[PDB]
Amino acid sequence: PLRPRLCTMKKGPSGYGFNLHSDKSKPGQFIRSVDPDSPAEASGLRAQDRIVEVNGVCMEGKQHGDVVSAIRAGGDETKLLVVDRETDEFFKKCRVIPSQEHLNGPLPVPFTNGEIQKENSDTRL
Amino acid sequence: PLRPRLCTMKKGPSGYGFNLHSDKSKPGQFIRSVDPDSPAEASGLRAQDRIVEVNGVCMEGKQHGDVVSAIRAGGDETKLLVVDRETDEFFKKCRVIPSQEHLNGPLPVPFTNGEIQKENSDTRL
């Protein structure tokens, strides 16, 4: 497969029904669990997904509470852009942060080992 | 023990007979003094106790004036849930706010340093 997935869900009587986890061992906010028959599960959210965007705003580099505040501040609805591990394990090789562009359109091309061997440092100024 | 204590007291001609203190050095509302032969002392209230609930309403996170106004608005009787200094340090190590449930039920299990060393951040959504 290897594309990100957008999860649109509406708050139920007791929330969305999933668990977000993060720790110092790795970067990123991950779905530890999703309750059965929950709004989160119906939208297509699954365990071990990593949150990339919350309602069209990028979450790369932000802390856990920032993502949590971003989700709680969206009202009774939220739209999460998420990637599974294999899709996540692909985009780092492209060195590309996933976005809404990748839901439909052409996917990036990974970098070869020889290109990383060059140890290039490039900056657009 | 290590459980909290409920202090039910009725206003005397000159109040309950205790003084409440707080300052910037520490969070929480603490009992600095309790008069002898006072309604507060008979109920079991002691100095250095920290107030957690006022008439079944938790006060964790509240300001000093909020707790005072809550006590004055309860009429001439009040039920205070309090913890001594030692009890407070145990619920902190458990990361659990005491409640009426800890008057009777099983006490929580503290977090180990290795689990806190991981600095995990989990959120129910």
CA nearest A31: which of B122, B118, B116? B122
Tokens of B60: 């964790």
Grouping H, G, I as helix, E, B as strand and the rest as coil, residue A12 is: strand
Pick from B121, B122, B125: which is nearest to A16 by CB?
B125
Rounded to the nearest angstrom, the minimum Cα separation between B121 and chain A is 6
Count: domains in chain B: 1
Using CA atoms, how far residue B89 sits from B22, B49, B85, B93, B104, in Å, is: 18, 12, 6, 6, 19
Q: Which residue of B has its CA nearest to A67?
A: B123
Give a yes or no: residue B75 inside a domain. Answer: yes
Question: Whole domain around residue B25: which residue ranges?
Answer: 1-103
Give a yes or no: residue A22 inside a domain. Answer: yes
Note whether A25 contacts B118, CB cutoff 8 Å: yes
Q: Which residue of B has its CA nearest to A78?
A: B125
Q: Which amino acid is at A30?
A: F
Backbone angles phi, psi at B104, to 5 degrees: -110, -50
CATH, residue B49: 2.30.42.10
Give a yes or no: residue A77 inside a domain. Answer: yes
CA nearest A55: which of A65, A69, A42, A38? A69
SS3 content of chain A, % helix, strand, coil (to 5): 25, 30, 45
Give a yes or no: residue B116 inside a domain. Answer: no
Tokens of A8: 């649109």
Give a yes or no: residue A115 inside a domain. Answer: no
Q: CB-based contacts of B32: which residues, under 8 Å, 6+ apart?
A: B19, B20, B21, B47
Find chain B residues with C-beta within 8 A of A24's C-beta.
Answer: 118-119
Report the residue of A9, A10, A20, A32 to disrupt the B interface, i.e. the one with the largest count of B CBs within 10 Å.
Answer: A20
Pick from A17, A20, A25: which is nearest to B123 by CB?
A20
Length of chain A equals 125
CA nearest A99: which of A36, A41, A54, A42? A54
CA nearest B96: which of A12, B41, B71, B106? B106
By the 10 Å C-beta count (0-12 exposed, 13-18 middle, 19+ buried), B79 is classed as: middle
Give a yes or no: residue B115 inside a domain. Answer: no
Alpha helices in chain A (DSSP H): 39-42, 64-72, 85-94, 101-104, 113-117
Give a yes or no: residue B61 inside a domain. Answer: yes
Separation of alpha carbons A114 and A119, rounded Å? 9
Q: Which residue of A has its CA nearest to B124?
A: A19
Listing DSSP states for B33-99 in one string gives EE-TT-HHHHTT--TT-EEEEETTEE-TT--HHHHHHHHHTTTTEEEEEEE-HHHHHHHHHHT----
Note whether B122 contacts A65, CB cutoff 8 Å: no
- Measured at the CA of A6, the angle between CA A77 and CA A84, to 5 degrees, comes to 125
Give a yes or no: residue B113 inside a domain. Answer: no
Pick from A15, A22, A65: which is nearest to B125 by CB?
A15
